[PDB]
């Protein structure tokens, strides 16, 4: 399938070259997979989600996304126009308040929630969790992400926006999850993207158009935007049967575009997420 005039990041993940604007992908499109977006919520009524999004948990007075961040990330995972995996099921877990903040204890509870809640959902092709959040190093946050991964969920986490080594941030520094850095439309490391040995992969993160609250759209930047590209890619590849939750991060790294990014520091992988779809 071909989506013309797609956001640059979608075109990038199906291309061996920057500078194109059509997204190519197998029509299965993540059907039968599920992606949990652990964030500020999801505006499930947005027409771009086509009824495939729902809120499953909140730790606050509402499950509504009063911020936009979670709706944007969910849109990159799976919206009809802005999403990688256009037929996946999206489940929102609101661990972040409407200012975008959340206590680590609530974030941990949300991760353990997903590990159990997947047993209440129909995801025959597999389960992914996208975590566009983080703070300073915490062994307990890392351990919660490790448990979620161990339970059979492909966990993708943002590397962070500190232009620093991700070793000092959590859950970015957890070895067993997929830590995602950000790139721009010219295949440069995004100026804010963290780096370091713990990164597994880069995805599009600068000037990413997606859904926003109020039935709207907007373009924003961050490793929070790169993470859902990778989460959606994992769901898409799992639906195709090319990988599993336990090995999807390594498979994405194996099949990535290699050595094409600039300003990647010595000791950080030079790998850009790529679906290897051949029309």
């Amino acid at each position: 399938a071909a989506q013309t005039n797609a956001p640059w990041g979608l075109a990038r993940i199906s291309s061996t070259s920057p500078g194109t604007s059509t997204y190519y992908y197998d029509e299965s499109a993540g059907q039968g997979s599920c992606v949990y977006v652990i964030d500020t919520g999801i505006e499930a009524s947005h027409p771009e989600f086509e009824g495939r999004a729902q809120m499953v948990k909140t730790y606050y007075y509402s499950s509504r996304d009063g911020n936009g961040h979670g709706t944007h990330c969910a849109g990159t995972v799976g919206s009809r126009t802005y999403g990688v995996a256009k037929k996946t099921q999206l489940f929102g877990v609101k661990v972040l308040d409407d200012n975008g903040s959340g206590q680590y204890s609530t974030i941990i509870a949300g991760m353990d929630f997903v590990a159990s809640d997947k047993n209440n959902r129909n995801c025959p092709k597999g389960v992914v969790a996208s975590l566009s959040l983080g703070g300073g190093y915490s062994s307990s946050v890392n351990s919660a992400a490790a448990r979620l991964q161990s339970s059979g969920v492909m966990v993708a986490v943002a590397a962070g926006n500190n232009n620093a080594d991700a070793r000092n941030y959590s859950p970015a520094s957890e070895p067993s999850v997929c830590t995602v850095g950000a790139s721009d439309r010219y295949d440069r490391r995004s100026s804010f993207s963290n780096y370091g040995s713990v990164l597994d992969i880069f995805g599009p993160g600068t000037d990413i158009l997606s859904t926003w609250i109020g039935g709207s759209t907007r373009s924003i930047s961050g490793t929070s935007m790169a993470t859902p590209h990778v989460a959606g890619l994992a769901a898409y590849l799992m639906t195709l049967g090319k990988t599993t939750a336990a090995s999807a991060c390594r498979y994405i790294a194996d099949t990535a575009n290699k050595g094409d990014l600039s300003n990647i520091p010595f000791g950080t992988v030079n790998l850009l997420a790529y679906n290897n779809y051949q029309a």
Side-chain angles (χ1 to χ4, degrees), residues 1-26 28-86 88-257 259-279:
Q3 176 192 349
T4 51
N5 304 112
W8 80 262
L10 299 192
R12 191 70 194 84
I13 71 160
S14 61
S15 185
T16 50
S17 288
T20 70
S21 63
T22 308
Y23 176 39
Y24 307 110
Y25 63 92
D26 187 276
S28 58
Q31 174 72 48
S33 70
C34 304
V35 184
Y36 286 85
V37 181
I38 304 177
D39 210 290
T40 64
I42 308 173
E43 188 174 270
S45 67
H46 200 302
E48 276 281 317
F49 296 122
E50 312 175 299
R52 290 178 290 102
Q54 63 188 285
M55 286 306 297
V56 300
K57 179 67 179 182
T58 182
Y59 298 89
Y60 306 91
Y61 48 80
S62 177
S63 69
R64 291 168 200 200
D65 181 10
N67 184 278
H69 183 269
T71 292
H72 195 277
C73 296
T76 299
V77 177
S79 67
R80 65 190 181 184
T81 305
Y82 310 100
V84 171
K86 297 176 189 301
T88 195
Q89 288 287 313
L90 298 162
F91 300 140
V93 178
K94 181 172 173 61
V95 301
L96 304 180
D97 64 30
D98 287 343
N99 299 310
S101 306
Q103 294 295 111
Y104 268 171
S105 44
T106 293
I107 292 163
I108 288 169
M111 285 193 247
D112 286 319
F113 170 85
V114 174
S116 182
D117 183 75
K118 67 177 193 289
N119 299 313
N120 288 323
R121 311 295 165 191
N122 288 297
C123 311
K125 298 298 184 188
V127 184
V128 182
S130 195
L131 284 66
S132 291
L133 54 73
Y137 179 84
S138 160
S139 63
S140 63
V141 170
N142 282 8
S143 172
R147 288 192 300 277
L148 181 56
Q149 176 73 50
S150 167
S151 85
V153 175
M154 189 290 179
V155 180
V157 310
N161 311 320
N162 318 96
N163 186 32
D165 198 305
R167 70 158 90 251
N168 279 321
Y169 302 93
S170 286
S173 59
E174 167 52 37
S176 71
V177 301
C178 208
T179 302
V180 183
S183 63
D184 75 17
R185 72 173 72 246
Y186 303 111
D187 284 351
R188 308 179 295 207
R189 179 173 65 90
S190 300
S191 60
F192 50 79
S193 184
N194 285 350
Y195 50 82
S197 63
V198 71
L199 267 68
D200 297 290
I201 191 67
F202 283 81
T206 299
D207 299 332
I208 305 304
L209 182 60
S210 192
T211 41
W212 200 254
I213 55 169
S216 76
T217 63
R218 76 176 55 178
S219 167
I220 50 165
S221 299
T223 65
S224 282
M225 286 68 252
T227 302
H229 281 92
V230 171
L233 178 58
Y236 165 90
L237 293 169
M238 295 156 52
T239 287
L240 281 176
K242 289 191 183 280
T243 190
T244 66
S247 45
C249 189
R250 169 186 306 210
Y251 179 89
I252 287 168
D254 283 355
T255 60
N257 280 311
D260 294 318
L261 299 173
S262 66
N263 201 37
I264 301 291
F266 204 72
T268 297
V269 295
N270 193 327
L271 300 169
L272 179 62
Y274 174 52
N275 73 0
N276 196 26
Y277 176 68
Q278 300 317 321

